[PDB]
Ligand binder design. Structure first.
Ligand SMILES: CCCCCCCCCCCCCCCCCC(=O)OC[C@H](COP(=O)([O-])OCC(O)COP(=O)([O-])OC[C@@H](COC(=O)CCCCCCCCCCCCCCCCC)OC(=O)CCCCCCCCCCCCCCCCC)OC(=O)CCCCCCCCCCCCCCCCC
Ligand SMILES: CCCCCCCCCCCCCCCCCC(=O)OC[C@H](COP(=O)(O)OCCN)OC(=O)CCCCCCCCCCCCCCCCC
Ligand SMILES: CCCCCCCCCCCCCCCCCC(=O)OC[C@H](COP(=O)(O)OCCN)OC(=O)CCCCCCCCCCCCCCCCC
Ligand SMILES: CCCCCCCCCCCCO[C@@H]1O[C@H](CO)[C@@H](O[C@H]2O[C@H](CO)[C@@H](O)[C@H](O)[C@H]2O)[C@H](O)[C@H]1O
Ligand SMILES: CCCCCCCCCCCCO[C@@H]1O[C@H](CO)[C@@H](O[C@H]2O[C@H](CO)[C@@H](O)[C@H](O)[C@H]2O)[C@H](O)[C@H]1O
Ligand SMILES: CCCCCCCCCCCCO[C@@H]1O[C@H](CO)[C@@H](O[C@H]2O[C@H](CO)[C@@H](O)[C@H](O)[C@H]2O)[C@H](O)[C@H]1O
Ligand SMILES: CCCCCCCCCCCCO[C@@H]1O[C@H](CO)[C@@H](O[C@H]2O[C@H](CO)[C@@H](O)[C@H](O)[C@H]2O)[C@H](O)[C@H]1O
Ligand SMILES: *C(=O)CCCCCCCCCCCCC
Lengths: 126, 171, 56, 84, 67, 103, 121, 459, 155, 79
């Protein structure tokens, strides 16, 4: 019985067939990843351990993340068949849906009240 | 980043801990622990590394099928019932710098000794930076490892936040 | 009725007193847990009186 | 309340109950491979016995480095803030 | 403390905890036995349950077929 | 797969410092230098007075002279009356039930 | 249970419907059927403030028990005799309901039997 | 109202003639005294409003808004005096002058008897507000935020001016007491549809209605703390207060014209509440929380029932204090770490224990824990919209769940967990900061003991 | 932070890709932007859709609670993948099998409850009998309209 | 500071660990950690009650008291 990955349940690393077939080209890439991580670690630790520092060690990665998650969207937005259809589907559609739900409910209720078939015997708070 | 040997030894430790979770009773666990150790021993001297990798891959598939869905976890290990329990009590040492003078006055001996550590940190820092400069290749460090102090009177570079970290049971 | 209603309310008011004492009025932090535990035990006694009246 | 000597005694106590180690040729500096002639599977079992002895886990990356009783004593004293 | 931990051995026990524990265990069994003696119906049945098949047609007002 | 000699040296040096730091967390004898059955009943006597008697005086005064002076603020379920009871307010005697069929 | 197997697996036509019974007149087959007597009056049950579901044909025993409980306070182990008299009356009441079910069942079985007799000509 | 207008004006000579080092002490003390006297507006009657003169009147709606407005001024001076410490003396006094002039316009706005007078003062508040944001905001984007704020308002308020003048030509008066008696029903026609929109859109943009709300998260992220406090606490309520008044003369057309705006609000509150769960900037999160709370007020005003109008009033007061608190709490973190990113500084309960209590209390009011006036207002709206249509309870109920999630998410992320290792400048809470927090929550929780005074005319 | 260190538009040329990878502290072989539609991601990296709970808990993270290192690129949905929120860890039972067994269990129970309503359990007794016309007055009956009598008989 | 009991006393003989060693020897194997478990099967841990023995804790004296109580009740009623 093979593992079937899903969006919310990743494939275990020990069952990943690419985990074992490791080439010299793949070891070279892993070494370069550890060099970037080590270079950033050193840059951080030099400020983190500095006895004269008091404040926040600004992290450009955090600044880039908060900037991307807001200000950078509209400049890189293109009106096309995808964003327009998603823009319409989840922008106007719910308002029209709820309009008909509530409008239909209220027309039915108002027609019964006028005909005197809605029980409002003790309804004096509104 | 894990060698073949490291992968095998990690599976052995992991498989035994899930076996212990199934067996529960010590005499029963001892019996099946020896049977499992025998299975690793039969292929101990495999030389054809292609076969060794296939044995490791098949073993991992076997572990996944037979793992305990609720294995035992040491209380303070990640996922344990006491993991991170005392983090709320861990306060960094720099917080003592903001104590009111009357608060510091209650521990005259502690804060006198604290000033000695701060003096030691201050006088050691420039040499720590220099040692890292002269020992680091041009393109920056390639690993996270740090060196010892080389001369006498020197301290290992970047020692403060390791030496002065909060106690595991700080209150 | 006067004892029944008076004692039922005193049970609830009794429980709020250790909370009011957190305003550092007449507090003994040495053993606040004992103080809170004592209030509960005394509230249990006062609540048994109206409970007894209902059973009767 | 652990002490450095208390940790050392229990670490050596466990090893003296392991049938693959001669209790007379064991010291705090004996190397599990270069002196006692054990292999890496044996070392993994020793670390697991220490984890059970002291009731906490030693991660694989740190465990594989502990190759003599003294290193285990030093490792445990560090995790538990034992200084005497 | 007055109880000192032991290594690989059964722990030290006080007399108070052993005597108190037995008294309340004995109290549990006396209560069950005492209650079962006097209130066994609460466990087995209060009243007899009749067999409806043994009720005559006369007392149930069942007329004969040709009536 | 053990420590390299440089790893061993660094751990030994940090270990010396860490143990020195932990020792320096011990309080000296004078620290903290601080700025300037008869009993059992009395402890429980003062508590009963201040946490039961005083509150009940206040509640009773409040109920008697403020709450119960307004309509329907305290409403009791009217007492059950059984056949054969006598009423205090009027002296009325409630007649008994019929004679039960034997059972 | 047993009756349920007969109705759901067997022939439902000869089994009583608990939600409709009785389906035969009370006096059908019962010359001079007496009325159920009632000892407690409506006013007595109203004054005793019995729960409506307790205002049944055994209420006089419940009222007698309730009075004893109030009078015997704080002895909560008294009134055992009065409690048993009320419990026993309710048992007899329940048995009468079992008799109604059994009577209805046998009448249905007679109705079916006559219909076999009628249509077997 | 002259007993409040003149002493408010006198705050300006006081600030300019004070000793250099006593501008904060003097302006704070005397604006607290003005706030004290504002409690005299509680002389309200069961039938008639408090009609002072031909220009100004007070009733149960404007009175609570007036007291909130005058209370906020000393709180704003407390909140601002720290980040303005380096500013030179003359510019400090100009800042205080803008706050004072804002209060003067606001108290006149809420008591103006004539609707065109209300319009001019309603518009006048833009000027000082825009100056505060663009001149004393910190970042480059305050200039854009100033423009969006200015032109969103004027795009709606200019049509309102035409409608108001048109009404006066047709009716002969814009006095609100006169309109109460001379109001005539609004018949169906395309002319009346656009008269309705002109009468309402300006107030919708200020509330803000969902779809016209995008200016508000901008304004908050760029404003100084005092700007955020007055924006959230009072300036949003100019729309609600305006809608509550002008709906008098729009019946019965509101019966069907309100439908699109009820749909936008009902669905809008769930969208904005959901958006809060993913916001990365703390000020932006609080800003989106306001849009969700004010969507309830729009619905309440539009369905026009006694319960909905009472709930709308309580919500406006309750949100004013809560949102002002939340901005002040977020600002006190900003003054230490100089970033609005919520995930930057974590586990602050370990470092600032008492400030974490204020965080807890503010969050609990934001999610409307009973019996806070936040809950009273929300509950009264939920009760009245249920009669309007039973299906609304599903949308109202879902929003309550999402509101709790994002309120506690904000509390958990910033106060709990592990502290950030490298942030080593979290100095102990100042007396000023603690007093500022308590001057929000204490009146808020005290109002629970006598809620009637914030329930409005329909009480 | 200069503008050259902030997110930019989607990269077109290989030189832009190399520049973007460097700005985000990534290998150019690892850097990959989100697909260029109208969404607005720009050049921000697309990283694996994995929870922080899946990261190694024994490594010495600069941010242990988040399991992040200073300077490393943050996933676009990092706030959704904190350990308090969405987990994507491997499960001992396949996702699709878990959904089958859970839905199957619930569906089976709902069917049986409907079955149990259609064939209820009950005891073999007749209706409970009450005096005074089935307690007509006690149940709020109108005292001016005589009730249709309810008579009970002995058995 | 703490005296560990002499390690030599921990033997698997007489314990169910001896049964496991016999089972393993049938396959040619050996359990080298057996003496590390021996303490769990020795001393005060050697004999634990069974489940039925656990439920009946205190039954003997509960029965003794019960018998005396009903005998007394039979006496009082008899008089
Ligand atoms: C006339 C005009 C009157 C003026 C106003 C007078 C009232 C203000 C009192 C000022 C004095 C306050 C004081 O000195 O006490 C210090 C008091 C105790 O000293 P401390 O232990 O050093 O405090 C440190 C921590 O902040 C302590 O933090 P903590 O976590 O230990 O406790 C703080 C507590 C906050 O304190 C409370 O709110 C008490 C619990 C609610 C009662 O937070 C909570 O527990 C939240 C619980 C909320 C849910 C409770 C269930 C809701 C039921 C609602 C019932 C409604 C009535 C029916 O500290 C505080 O509570 C600070 C906040 C004080 C204002 C709270 C609001 C009170 C109104
Ligand atoms: C930007 C470029 C476009 C500029 C706007 C375009 C003009 C839109 C005009 C809408 C129609 C209003 C109108 O002309 O009504 C005229 C009519 C006057 O006739 P009267 O004799 O006085 O009364 C009987 C009614 N026939 O009846 C009336 O006078 C009633 C109208 C009252 C005043 C209307 C105010 C302007 C309405 C348009 C804006 C409404 C939408 C606002 C949206 C803002 C969103 C931020
Ligand atoms: C009526 C309309 C109702 C509307 C409901 C709206 C619900 C909103 C959806 C939740 C939004 C999530 C907010 C973020 C919270 C979060 O991410 O928490 C994740 C948390 C993980 O918790 P855990 O699995 O225990 O992991 C701990 C160890 N790492 O996991 C959680 O704690 C969240 C789990 C809750 C998920 C929602 C489940 C809803 C169930 C409804 C079905 C029942 C229907 C009614 C009852 C049946 C009839 C009797
Ligand atoms: C209203 C009546 C309610 C019921 C009242 C019943 C009261 C009965 C009190 C009995 C008191 C018995 O007290 C306890 O009994 C047990 C009997 O195993 C003793 O235990 C005894 O056996 C165990 C092993 O089986 C050994 O420790 C030892 O041989 C001896 O102690 C305890 O040492 C004694 O402390
Ligand atoms: C007939 C029409 C003209 C009507 C004029 C009525 C008012 C005339 C006022 C004349 C005196 C003005 O006073 C002049 O201005 C201010 C306030 O006093 C003083 O200077 C001021 O500096 C700072 C504020 O900036 C403060 O310390 C303090 O308010 C004061 O010392 C000058 O030192 C003084 O020379
Ligand atoms: C519906 C009722 C309310 C409608 C109100 C609409 C009126 C216009 C409001 C905004 C006016 C701001 O005026 C101008 O707008 C544009 C964007 O829109 C701003 O420009 C901003 O967005 C554009 C477009 O993404 C960018 O190219 C630019 O880098 C950025 O600064 C200008 O810097 C500002 O000067
Ligand atoms: C008193 C208890 C009352 C509740 C009892 C409810 C039990 C009802 C269980 C219904 C759900 C069973 O659902 C069914 O399970 C079997 C066994 O896994 C699955 O069977 C499948 O999965 C297994 C495992 O991967 C494989 O052999 C193969 O893929 C296939 O056989 C079906 O795909 C699924 O549809
Ligand atoms: C006889 O007195 C009734 C006893 C109750 C028997 C209940 C049987 C339950 C079996 C499963 C129910 C399935 C749904 C019809």
């Amino acid at each position: 019985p093979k593992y079937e990955a899903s969006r919310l349940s990743s494939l275990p690393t020990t069952l990943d067939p690419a985990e074992y077939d490791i080439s010299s080209e793949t070891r070279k890439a892993q070494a370069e990843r550890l060099a970037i991580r080590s270079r950033l670690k050193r840059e951080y630790q030099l400020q983190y351990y500095d006895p004269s520092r008091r404040g926040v060690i600004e992290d450009p990665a955090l600044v880039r993340w908060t900037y991307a998650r807001s200000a950078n969207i509209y400049p890189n937005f293109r009106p096309n068949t995808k964003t327009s259809l998603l823009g319409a589907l989840f922008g106007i559609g719910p308002l029209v849906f709820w309009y008909y739900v509530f409008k239909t409910d209220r027309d039915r209720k108002e027609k019964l009240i006028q005909e005197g078939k809605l029980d409002r015997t003790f309804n004096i708070s509104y | 980043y894990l060698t073949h040997q490291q992968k095998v030894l990690r599976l052995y430790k992991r498989a035994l801990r899930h076996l212990e979770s199934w067996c529960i009773h010590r005499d029963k666990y001892r019996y099946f622990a020896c049977l499992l150790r025998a299975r690793f021993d039969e292929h101990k001297n495999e030389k054809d590394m292609v076969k060794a990798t296939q044995l490791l891959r098949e073993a991992e598939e076997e572990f996944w099928h037979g793992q305990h869905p609720q294995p035992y976890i040491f209380p303070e290990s990640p996922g344990g019932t006491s993991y991170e329990r005392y983090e709320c009590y861990k306060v960094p040492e720099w917080c003592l710098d903001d104590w009111h003078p009357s608060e510091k006055a209650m521990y005259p001996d502690y804060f006198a000794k604290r000033e000695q550590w701060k003096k030691l940190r201050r006088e050691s820092w420039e040499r720590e930076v220099k040692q890292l400069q002269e020992e680091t290749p041009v393109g920056g460090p390639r690993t996270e490892a740090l060196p010892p102090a080389r001369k006498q009177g020197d301290l290992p570079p970047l020692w403060w936040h390791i030496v002065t970290r909060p106690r595991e049971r700080p209150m | 009725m006067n004892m029944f209603s008076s004692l039922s309310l005193v049970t609830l008011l009794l429980l709020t007193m250790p909370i009011m004492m957190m305003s550092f009025n007449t507090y003994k932090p040495s053993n606040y847990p004992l103080y809170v535990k004592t209030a509960i035990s005394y509230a249990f006694i006062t609540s048994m009186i109206p409970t007894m009246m209902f059973i009767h | 309340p652990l002490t450095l000597e208390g940790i050392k005694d229990r670490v050596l106590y466990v090893l003296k109950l392991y049938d693959k180690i001669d209790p007379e040729k064991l010291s705090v500096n004996s190397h599990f491979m270069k002196d006692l002639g054990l292999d890496s599977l044996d070392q993994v079992e020793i670390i697991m016995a220490m984890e059970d002895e002291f009731g906490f886990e030693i991660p694989d990356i740190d465990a594989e480095k502990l190759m003599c009783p003294q290193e285990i004593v030093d490792y445990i004293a560090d995790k538990k803030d034992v200084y005497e | 403390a007055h109880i000192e931990p032991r290594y690989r051995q059964f722990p030290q026990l006080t007399r108070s905890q052993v005597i108190q524990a037995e008294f309340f265990s004995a109290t549990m069994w006396f209560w069950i036995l005492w209650r079962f003696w006097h209130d066994s119906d609460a466990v087995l049945g209060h009243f007899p349950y009749p067999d409806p098949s043994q009720w005559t047609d006369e007392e149930l007002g069942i007329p004969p077929d040709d009536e | 797969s053990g420590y390299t000699p440089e790893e061993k040296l660094r751990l030994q040096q940090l270990r010396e410092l860490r143990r020195r730091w932990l020792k320096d967390q011990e309080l000296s004898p004078r620290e903290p230098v601080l700025p300037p059955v008869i009993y059992k009943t009395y402890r429980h006597s003062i508590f009963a007075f201040t946490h039961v008697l005083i509150p009940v005086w206040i509640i009773h005064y409040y109920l008697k002279y403020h709450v119960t002076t307004k309509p329907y603020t305290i409403v009791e379920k009217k007492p059950r009356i059984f056949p054969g009871d006598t009423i205090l307010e009027t002296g009325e005697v409630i007649p008994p039930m019929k004679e039960f069929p034997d059972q | 249970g047993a009756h349920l197997a007969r109705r759901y697996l067997g022939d439902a036509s000869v089994e009583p419907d608990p939600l409709r019974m009785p389906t035969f007149p009370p006096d059908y087959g019962f010359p001079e059927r007496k009325e159920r007597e009632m000892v407690a009056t409506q006013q007595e049950m109203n004054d005793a403030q019995l729960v409506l579901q307790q205002r049944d044909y055994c209420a006089h025993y419940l009222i007698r028990f309730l009075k004893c409980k109030r009078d015997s306070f704080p002895n909560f182990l008294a009134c055992k005799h009065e409690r048993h008299d009320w419990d026993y009356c309710e048992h007899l009441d329940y048995v009468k309901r079992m008799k109604e079910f059994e009577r209805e069942r046998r009448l249905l079985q007679r109705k079916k039997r006559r219909e076999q007799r009628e249509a077997d000509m | 109202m002259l007993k409040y207008i003149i002493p408010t004006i006198m705050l300006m000579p006081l600030t300019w003639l004070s000793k250099n080092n006593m501008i904060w002490v003097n302006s704070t003390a005397h604006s607290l005294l003005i706030s004290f006297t504002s409690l005299l507006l509680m002389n309200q009657f069961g039938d008639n409003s408090l009609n002072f003169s031909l220009l100004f009147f007070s009733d149960s709606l404007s009175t609570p808004l007036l007291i909130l407005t005058m209370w906020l001024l000393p709180l704003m001076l407390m909140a601002s005096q720290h980040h303005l410490s380096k500013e030179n003396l003359t510019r400090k006094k100009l800042f205080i002058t803008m706050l004072i002039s804002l209060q003067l316009f606001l108290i006149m706005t809420f008591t103006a008897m004539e609707l065109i007078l209300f319009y001019i003062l309603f518009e006048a508040t833009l000027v000082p507000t825009l100056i505060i944001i663009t001149r004393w905001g910190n970042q480059t984007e305050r200039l854009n935020a100033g423009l969006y704020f200015l032109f969103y308002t004027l795009a709606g308020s200019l049509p309102l001016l035409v409608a108001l003048i048109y009404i006066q030509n047709t009716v002969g008066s814009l006095n609100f007491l006169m309109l109460q008696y001379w109001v005539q029903p609004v018949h169906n026609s395309w002319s009346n549809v656009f008269m309705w929109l002109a009468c309402m859109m300006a107030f919708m943009v200020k509330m803000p209605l969902y779809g016209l709300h995008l200016w508000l998260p901008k304004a908050h992220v760029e404003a100084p703390i005092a700007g955020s406090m007055v924006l959230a606490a009072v300036l949003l309520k100019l729309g609600g207060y305006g809608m509550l008044r002008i709906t008098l003369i729009l019946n019965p057309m509101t019966d069907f014209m309100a439908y699109p705006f009820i749909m936008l609000s009902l669905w809008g509150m769930i969208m904005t509440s959901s958006i809060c769960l993913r916001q990365t900037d703390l000020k932006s999160l609080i800003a989106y929380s306001s849009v969700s709370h004010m969507a309830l007020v729009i619905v309440a005003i539009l369905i026009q029932t006694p319960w909905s109008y009472m709930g709308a009033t309580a919500l406006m007061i309750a949100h004013g204090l809560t949102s002002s608190m939340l901005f002040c709490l977020a600002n006190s973190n900003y003054e230490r770490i100089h970033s609005r990113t919520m995930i930057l500084a974590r586990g602050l309960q370990t470092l600032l224990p008492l400030m974490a209590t204020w965080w807890l209390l503010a969050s609990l009011t934001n999610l409307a824990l009973p019996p806070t006036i936040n809950l009273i207002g929300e509950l009264f709206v939920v009760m009245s919209t249920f009669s309007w249509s039973n299906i609304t309870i599903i949308l109202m109920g879902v929003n309550m769940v999402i509101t709790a999630l994002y309120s506690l998410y904000m509390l958990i992320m910033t106060q709990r967990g592990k502290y950030t290792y490298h942030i080593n400048n979290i100095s102990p809470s100042f007396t000023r900061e603690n007093a500022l927090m308590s001057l929000h929550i204490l009146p808020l929780l005290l109002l629970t003991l006598n809620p009637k005074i914030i329930l409005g005319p329909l009480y | 932070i200069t503008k050259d260190m902030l997110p930019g538009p989607y990269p077109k040329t290989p030189e832009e890709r190399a520049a973007a990878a460097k700005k985000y502290n990534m290998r150019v072989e690892d850097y990959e932007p989100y697909p260029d539609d109208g969404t607005g991601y720009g050049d921000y990296p697309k990283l694996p859709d994995r929870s922080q709970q899946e990261r190694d808990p024994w490594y010495d993270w600069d941010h242990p609670d988040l399991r992040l290192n200073w300077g490393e690129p943050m996933h676009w949905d990092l706030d959704m993948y904190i350990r308090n929120r969405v987990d994507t860890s491997p499960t001992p039972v396949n996702w699709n099998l878990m959904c089958k067994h859970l839905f199957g269990f619930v569906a089976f129970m709902l069917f049986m409850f409907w079955v149990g309503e259609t064939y209820p359990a009950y005891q073999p007794v007749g209706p409970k009998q009450y005096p005074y016309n089935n307690l007509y007055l006690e149940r709020g009956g109108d005292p001016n309209k005589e009730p249709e009598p309810v008579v009970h008989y002995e058995i | 500071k703490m005296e560990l009991p002499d390690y030599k006393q921990w033997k698997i003989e007489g314990t169910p660990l001896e049964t496991v060693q016999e089972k393993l020897a049938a396959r040619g194997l050996r359990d080298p950690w057996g003496r590390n478990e021996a303490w769990r099967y020795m001393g005060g841990f050697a004999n634990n009650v069974s489940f039925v023995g656990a439920l009946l804790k205190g039954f003997k004296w509960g029965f003794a008291a019960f018998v005396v109580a009903i005998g007394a009740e039979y006496y009082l009623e008899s008089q």
